[PDB]
Amino acid sequence: LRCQCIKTYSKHPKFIKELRVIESGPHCANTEIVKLSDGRDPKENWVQVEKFLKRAENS
C-alpha cells in the first residue's frame, strides 16, 4: 500500500548497484529504494542514475 522510502536522508556514488523506479501510483502519495555495495531523488545534484545509466549505456 502506497509508495515507500519516506526516510529520505542527506549524507557512495561508487557503491550503487541496485535501484527501482516508482514515482506515482493509485495508492502512492509520495515521491521515490537503492542498494549499496554490501546491501542497504531527481532534485539531488549527483543522484540525478542517468550517469549510472551511462555506466551501463550499452542498452
Partner: protein, 249 residues
C-alpha cells in the same frame, strides 16, 4: 547509516481460501439460513422485524461479494468487478450501520414506518457509497481503494463518510447523556478499527502525521490488513448476533 528500505504485504498475501473463500462460503450459507428461516416460519415475532431481516440480507450480500475482492482468486480482475465488489461491500456495511442507528433511535416507536424507514436507509446507504465506488479500481490485479491527487476529493469524501459512520457515529451515540442495551454494538466494535485505521492511513498518505520510524509504517500496514480481515469476518459474524437479537426479546 541512514537507509530507507522497507516493504510489506502483511498476513494477507496468498493464504487465500483457508481464511476468506471458506469464510465467504460459510457466510453465504449462514446468511441464507437465517434469511430463509424468517421466510419459512416464534420467528415472526421480532420487533422491527424487517430492519433485522435487511441486516441479515446485507450480510448475505457481503458474503456473496467477499471472494470478489479477496486475494488468492483469479488475477486480471476487471476494474468494473472490483468497483462493484467495493460498492456492494461498503454499501452493505453502511446500510447495516445506518439501520442499526435508526433501530437504536426508533426501537420502541403509520403503515409506512417499516417501508419508509427501510427505503430511506438504503437510499442514504447507497448514496454514501458513491465516493468509494467512484474512487475504486484494481491496479495490478488487486482490489484497491484509489488514494491519489487525481481522485483526492473523492477519497477525502469517502474517508470522512467512513470515519463518521463507523467511528464517529458510534462515538456520537456515546455522547447520549436504561434503553441503551444495544446488544448489537459488537458490529460497530468490529467496524471501528477499520474506520480509525482508514483515518490514520488518510493522514499518513497526505503526509499530515508524525510517523517517525519505519516501525510506524510496518505497524500501519499490519493494522490495515488486520482491519480488513476483522471487517471481512462480519459476514459470518452477524447471523449469530441476529439469532441472539431474535432470542433476546
Amino acid at each position: 547509516e541512514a537507509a530507507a528500505p522497507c516493504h510489506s504485504c502483511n498476513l494477507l498475501d496468498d493464504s487465500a481460501l483457508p481464511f476468506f473463500i471458506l469464510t465467504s462460503v460459510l457466510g453465504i450459507l449462514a446468511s441464507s439460513t437465517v434469511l430463509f428461516m424468517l421466510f419459512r416460519p416464534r420467528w415472526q415475532l421480532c420487533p422491527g422485524w424487517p430492519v433485522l431481516a435487511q441486516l441479515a440480507v446485507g450480510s448475505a450480500l457481503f458474503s456473496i461479494v467477499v471472494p470478489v475482492l479477496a486475494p488468492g482468486l483469479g488475477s486480471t480482475r476487471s476494474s468494473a468487478l472490483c468497483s462493484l465488489g467495493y460498492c456492494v461491500w461498503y454499501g452493505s456495511a453502511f446500510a447495516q450501520a445506518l439501520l442499526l442507528g435508526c433501530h437504536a433511535s426508533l426501537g420502541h416507536r403509520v403503515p409506512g414506518l417499516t417501508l419508509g424507514l427501510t427505503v430511506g436507509i438504503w437510499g442514504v446507504a447507497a448514496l454514501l457509497t458513491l465516493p468509494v465506488t467512484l474512487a475504486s479500481g484494481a491496479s495490478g490485479g488487486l482490489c484497491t481503494l484509489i488514494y491519489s491527487t487525481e481522485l483526492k476529493a473523492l477519497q477525502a469524501t469517502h474517508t470522512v463518510a467512513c470515519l463518521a459512520i463507523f467511528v464517529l457515529l458510534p462515538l456520537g451515540l456515546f455522547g447520549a447523556k436504561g434503553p441503551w442495551m444495544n446488544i448489537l454494538w459488537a458490529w460497530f466494535i468490529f467496524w471501528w478499527p477499520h474506520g480509525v485505521v482508514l483515518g490514520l492511513d488518510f493522514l499518513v498518505r497526505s503526509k499530515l502525521l508524525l510517523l517517525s520510524t519505519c516501525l510506524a509504517q510496518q505497524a500501519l500496514d499490519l493494522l490495515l490488513n488486520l482491519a480488513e480481515a476483522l471487517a471481512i469476518l462480519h459476514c459470518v459474524a452477524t447471523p449469530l448476533l441476529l439469532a441472539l437479537f431474535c432470542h433476546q426479546a
